């Protein structure tokens, strides 16, 4: 019925915080997801572009 394709950049290892239930400064103050979240988390290396 609708889709929201969010995007952002992290230092690589901080991906462990971008997930429901996880904790950390990121998940607590920048990007928090609800327990009923439904979607996919996709990431790839961008050292040459970013």
């Amino acid at each position, epitope marked *: 019925t609708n889709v929201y394709a969010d*995007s952002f950049v992290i230092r690589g290892n901080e991906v462990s915080q971008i997930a429901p239930g996880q904790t950390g400064n990121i998940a607590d103050y920048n990007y928090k997801l609800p327990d009923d979240f439904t979607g996919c988390v996709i990431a790839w290396n961008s050292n*040459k*572009l*970013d």
Partner: antibody, heavy 121, light 109 residues
């Protein structure tokens, strides 16, 4: 001071292969995107593709996906631009550009001296 | 989509002029992915403006970028003899660079 040097003018017959070079200096040829730009006599600039010295992650232009090839050598820090079966419309000035210390990674803040190509029957 | 520019530009020395550029692209990052380049007869081009709300370092203040809707513009504080050169605008939004039709600038007097 950063600078790029290119080969002299090239002259060949229609339907012949050609390959030029463009050597950069004054910077570490490891983390700076390198590409080539086409400019026919009296025409504007036309981008063809870029490459990363760290790895051969070529990104050619949609109009130059198989008409031209781009590559570079990290052991000598010199780009290359090879052609196959040069056509009459390939005569043009080719400049090798690269990113600068600021801006986007495809801004092409610097340019080369240009390499002229001409063909005739 | 490819960019477009007027065929040629003209103006008297000392007076300000503006060169238009249509076809600017955008992405989810922003909408200021526009740059300009200048190329004198007989030499390679040179970056003039990028991120029209700003400009490259060391570039004189005689060049200023702008944009409104889907059309960019380049404003010159004052025309001079050294301004007789070609100008081209480019867009770098969708991880790609495409140059426009260009334009020729000349000064009267």
């Amino acid at each position: 001071q950063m600078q790029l040097v290119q080969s002299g003018a090239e002259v060949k017959k229609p339907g012949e292969s050609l390959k030029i070079s463009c050597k950069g200096s004054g910077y570490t040829f490891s983390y700076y995107w390198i590409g080539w730009v086409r400019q026919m006599p009296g025409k504007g600039l036309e981008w063809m593709g870029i490459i990363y010295p760290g790895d051969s992650d070529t990104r050619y232009s949609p109009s130059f996906q198989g008409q031209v090839t781009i590559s570079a050598d990290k052991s000598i820090s010199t780009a290359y631009l090879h052609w196959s079966s040069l056509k009459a419309s390939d005569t043009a000035m080719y400049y090798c550009a690269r990113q600068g210390d600021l801006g986007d990674w495809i801004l092409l803040g610097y340019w080369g001296q240009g390499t002229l190509v001409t063909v005739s029957s | 989509s490819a960019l477009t520019q007027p065929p040629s530009a003209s103006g008297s020395p000392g007076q300000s002029v503006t060169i238009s550029c249509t076809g600017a692209s955008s992405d989810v990052g922003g909408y200021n992915y526009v740059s300009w380049y200048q190329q004198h007869p007989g030499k390679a081009p040179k970056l003039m403006i990028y991120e029209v709300n700003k400009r490259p370092s060391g570039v004189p203040d005689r060049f200023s970028g702008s944009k409104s809707g889907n059309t960019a513009s380049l404003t010159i504080s004052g025309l001079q003899a050294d301004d007789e050169a070609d100008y081209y605008c480019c867009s770098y939004a969708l991880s790609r660079v495409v140059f426009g039709g260009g334009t020729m600038l000349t000064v009267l007097g």
